[PDB]
Amino acid sequence: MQNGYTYEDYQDTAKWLLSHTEQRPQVAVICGSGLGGLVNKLTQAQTFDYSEIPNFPESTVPGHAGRLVFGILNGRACVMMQGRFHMYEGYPFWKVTFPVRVFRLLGVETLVVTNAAGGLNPNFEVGDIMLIRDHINLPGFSGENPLRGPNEERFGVRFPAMSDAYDRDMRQKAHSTWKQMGEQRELQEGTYVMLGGPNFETVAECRLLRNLGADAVGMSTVPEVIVARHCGLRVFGFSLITNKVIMDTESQGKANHEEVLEAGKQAAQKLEQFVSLLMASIPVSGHTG
Amino acid sequence: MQNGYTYEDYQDTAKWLLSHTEQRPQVAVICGSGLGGLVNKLTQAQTFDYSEIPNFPESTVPGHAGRLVFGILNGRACVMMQGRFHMYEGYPFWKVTFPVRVFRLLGVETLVVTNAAGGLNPNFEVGDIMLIRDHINLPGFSGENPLRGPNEERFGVRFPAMSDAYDRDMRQKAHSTWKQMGEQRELQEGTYVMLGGPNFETVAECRLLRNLGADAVGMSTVPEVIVARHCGLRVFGFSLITNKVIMDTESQGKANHEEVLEAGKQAAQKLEQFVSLLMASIPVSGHTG
Amino acid sequence: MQNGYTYEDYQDTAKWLLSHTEQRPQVAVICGSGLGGLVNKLTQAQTFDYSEIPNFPESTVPGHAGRLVFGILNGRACVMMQGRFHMYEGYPFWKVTFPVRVFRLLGVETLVVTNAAGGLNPNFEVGDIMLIRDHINLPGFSGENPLRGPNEERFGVRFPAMSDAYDRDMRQKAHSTWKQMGEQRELQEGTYVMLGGPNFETVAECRLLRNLGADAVGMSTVPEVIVARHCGLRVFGFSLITNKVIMDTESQGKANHEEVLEAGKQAAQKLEQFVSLLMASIPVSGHTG
Ligand SMILES: O=c1[nH]cnc2c([C@@H]3O[C@H](CO)[C@@H](O)[C@H]3O)c[nH]c12
Ligand SMILES: O=c1[nH]cnc2c([C@@H]3O[C@H](CO)[C@@H](O)[C@H]3O)c[nH]c12
Ligand SMILES: O=c1[nH]cnc2c([C@@H]3O[C@H](CO)[C@@H](O)[C@H]3O)c[nH]c12
């Protein structure tokens, strides 16, 4: 059936975490494939395995550790999902996005989503960082949506708008911060398209997606962005272009999960630093003062 | 699993209605968001709340009253669904389309479907009435179809054609009737595309859908048109363009459910009159005479 | 839930077949709508109704006999599925593709898939044979995939590549063999697109699919190709263009299942001979010698 989680289920989980840590994060960060190293920048870190937290699902994908880590990143208190969940694991979207609603109940105001994606835009290179300015939700087109079923008014409204999903002011800041880093390669920005997986795309599917206007293709993030927005979380996200998708039948090679080599190795120090500097200020937003 | 309704389930429901009303409608009308006012033109009306009719599902969306109303509209006896069901409510297509098969068993010959839709075609304006000449069924592309599972030969054949879904002669009549109304704004006609919802589309999705050739986007109607056609019901339908979809990232605003303001208020008297005049004649079709 | 079949389920079924026949096929052939006649070329044939083989699903579509036939085709020992399964019958993809994994466990190395498809490419004619060089998996875009859920490492890896699904060397051979037949009509080759069904497409959907780059549209094959590739089966496939899809609203007619007339009658002797000659050699591939 539809969402099997009740409001109290999120309530209980949030209560469990609050009674087990003194940290009160405002920023929540989700780490995609091979981006699990973002965690080792945190100070005063406390790690919780998903399996010990009440209603939490579990990461079954290599590159996804399956741990919730609270810590202080460059002065700001945040919580990180070292590994996320995907629909191709057998998880329904209402299970995949469970942690987004828990964050909301913990008092989190901002959510930054990351992921590894295949490059569709020809100007993208392996190793590029693409700011997600927009997305195309293919599973959504068919009713596969985390918000399907009766609406929980306590989180948001029945018909939430998505045209303004990715925060404009945060994307301005990302660009400004990149300049300060002195990166030779420019900061990319585009549309992220989500499909189910777990197999990689055929040439025809890559050409089709590109013609639809997508810049990168992945198998996650979008459900989370929808639930986040629905409950009023400010959102920002970026894709690490781990590979160039096959656009020709004269296939030199084929995609493979070794793309973690591009993330948790190749572009480790870069985006980890990019995200740390990014914790400069929402500006915070703490009522007054 | 697939369709949980047996032929007898539709039989029973049809029998219940027939033994509770003296009205024998030939035309069935389904009212979409904010079009619930079409009901108050009926004479000798008898209302049934969906909750009292045996195997009937229930409308949970504001703008959808959830009542079956029998009445006489401009001389013709018809039955109206004051509010429909959607997949985003958690309803499977076989539940969403239940009433279409009941209508067939009541003796109904024509079904007119209405709905509120976002305008993709740039020449459309808020308040426009678009005749549905065709549709694109996105959920259908993935197997999400009201006819999935074993086929009930008593209703129709296994592989029904959809290329001739929207009656040609009725669309000629709609245009002729519009002329007689003296409307300054021309009568629109286009392709309706259905997606799951309940969130509104992103700019990228709107551009994608437009490039696919769709004129308006909605979250209903199509499943109903398929089941109707499958059982031999003549079909006609139109969309009330309640809003202009966001096609640019320089987002002035965002879509919201207040679009009922455009329907159940703004274009009330117009389409209600358009539908009343439309009950001129199939010509009826009553064997001979 | 996800795949309800365990590795032992495939093991058991493979064992059952092996202890009931002396034939050890290397090639497996799947027959689509109206192509069931490919079976009557086999020598030393042994037929098994799907209903008698342990974990086997059942064909409910006319044109699909529902029998597993072992035999010798032009010198090569093979097994044939006289009739396949489709998602529109109510079958989940993990049920639809069950036989592909059984074949793998029997020792099969090559799988040739066939099907009846509607022509999108304007240069195609009814009766044409199209080599499947690639595919677009619409249900896959939304997570509807035979590999969803935990991965069985004993069959393949979590993220299998699909860009090289259709064997290049076998498609070279198909072209060479066609020349030897002396066919006046050239051998077609293109992209196959899969959608759910069971209804036929609207004009708008046909134009949409064509613009996406598809040459033929069908309601099967793809799930099977994915599971096959995942477990290392060499794959080759072709579509019998049974009809021209409706691309204009000035609809002369509409599609219907009578397309079996084009297959199991019209192009019977041709493709049956084409497939028999095609059993020339992988070259076999039998370790050494
Ligand atoms: O080219 C790609 N296509 C689709 N998904 C991905 C990913 C993402 O990485 C994981 C697999 O490595 C998946 O979880 C997927 O979403 C990276 N590259 C691609
Ligand atoms: O722009 C739009 N996009 C998608 N659906 C709708 C609707 C339709 O109205 C209800 C929500 O107001 C939904 O039921 C939807 O199908 C109107 N406008 C749009
Ligand atoms: O034009 C077509 N569109 C979609 N599917 C098919 C088939 C295939 O044949 C069976 C129905 O005859 C279905 O099983 C379908 O996959 C043939 N032609 C078309």
3-state secondary structure chain B: CCCCCCHHHHHHHHHHHHCCCCCCCCEEEEECCCCHHHHHHCEEEEEEEHHHCCCCCCCCCCCCCCEEEEEEECCEEEEEEECCCCHHHCCCHHHHCHHHHHHHHHCCCEEEEEEEEEECCCCCCCCCEEEEEEEEEHHHHCCCCCCCCCCCCCCCCCCCCCCCCCCHHHHHHHHHHHHHHCCCCCCEEEEEEECCCCCCCCHHHHHHHHHCCCCEEECCCHHHHHHHHHCCCEEEEEEEEEEECCCCCCCCCCCCHHHHHHHHHHCHHHHHHHHHHHCCCCCCCCCCC
Q: Which of C30, C33, C243 to mutate to test the pocket of ligand 3 (most atoms within 8 A of CB)?
A: C33
Contact C200 B160 (CB under 8 A): yes
Q: Hey, are the CB atoms on C164 and A251 less than 8 Å from each other?
A: yes
Buried-exposed string C32-46: b where 16+ CB fall within 10 A, e elsewhere: bbbbbbbbebbeeee
* Of the candidates C142, C118, C140, C132, the residue with the CA atom closest to the CA atom of residue C209: C118
With beta carbons under 8 A apart, name residues in chain C contacting B93.
none
User: What is the distance between the alpha carbons of residues B85 and B94, in angstroms, rounded to a whole number?
Assistant: 11
- B203: chain A residues, CB-CB within 8 Å: 134, 163
The structure's method of determination equals X-ray
Taking the mean position of all CA atoms in its chain, how far away is CA B99? 12
Kindly state the helix (H) or strand (E) to which residue A192 belongs, with its residue range.
strand A188-194
- Give CA–CA dist A281/A231, Å, rounded: 21
Consecutive H or E run containing A117: strand A110-119
* 3-class DSSP assignment, residue A13: helix
**Closest residue of chain C to B143, computed from CA coordinates:** C196
The torsion angles phi and psi of A55, rounded to 5 degrees, stand at: -85, 25
| Residue A247 CB less than 6 A away from ligand 1 | no
Distance of alpha carbon A36 from the chain centroid: 12
CA distance A283 to A277: 13
* Resolution of this structure in Å: 2.4
Q: How far is the CA of B215 from the centre of ligand 2 (A)?
A: 13
- Which among B208, B185, B186, B183 has a CA at the least distance from the CA of B195? B208
Domains and CATH numbers, chain A: 1-289 (3.40.50.1580)
| Residues whose CB is less than 8 angstroms from the CB of residue C104 and which lie 6 or more positions away in sequence, other chains included | C155, C228, C231, C232, C233
Letter string b/e over residues B140-175, b meaning 16 or more CB atoms within 10 A of that residue's CB: bbbbbbbbbbebbeebbebbbbbbbbbbeebbebbe
Task: Give the three-state DSSP class for A53.
Answer: coil
B209: left (phi over 0), alpha (psi -120 to 50) or beta: alpha
Query: Considering just the CA atoms, what is the radius of gyration of chain A in Å?
Result: 18
- Residues A120, A214: contact at Cβ < 8 Å? yes
> B268, B247, B145, B143: which is closest to B200 by C-alpha?
B247
A245 C-beta closer than 6 A to ligand 1: yes
Go through A1-27 and write b for each residue having 16 or more CB atoms within 10 A of its CB, e for each that does not: ebbebeeebbeebbebbeeeeebebbb
For residue C222 the two structure tokens come to: 């793809």
Strand partners, A68: A48, A81
Mutate to test the interface with C, among A202, A203, A206 (most CBs of C within 10 A): A202
What is the 8-class DSSP label of residue A242?
Answer: E
Picking from B87, B139, B204, the nearest residue to A136 by CB comes out as B204
Please, are residues B239 and B271 in contact by the beta-carbon 8 Å criterion? no
Residue A124 neighbours by CB under 8 Å, 6+ apart: A130, A188, A215, A216, A241, A244
Residues 6 or more apart whose CB falls under 8 angstroms from that of C279 comprise: C27, C73, C74, C75, C76, C78
- Residues in chain A after which the chain is broken, C→N over 2.5 Å: none
Cα separations in angstroms, B175 against B169, B172, B181, B183, B221 = 10, 5, 10, 11, 21
Query: Is any atom of ligand 3 closer than 6 Å to the C-beta of C3?
Result: no
**Rounded alpha-carbon distances, angstroms, from residue A154 to A177, A228, B61:** 36, 13, 17
- CA distance linking residue C200 with residue C35, whole number of Å: 20
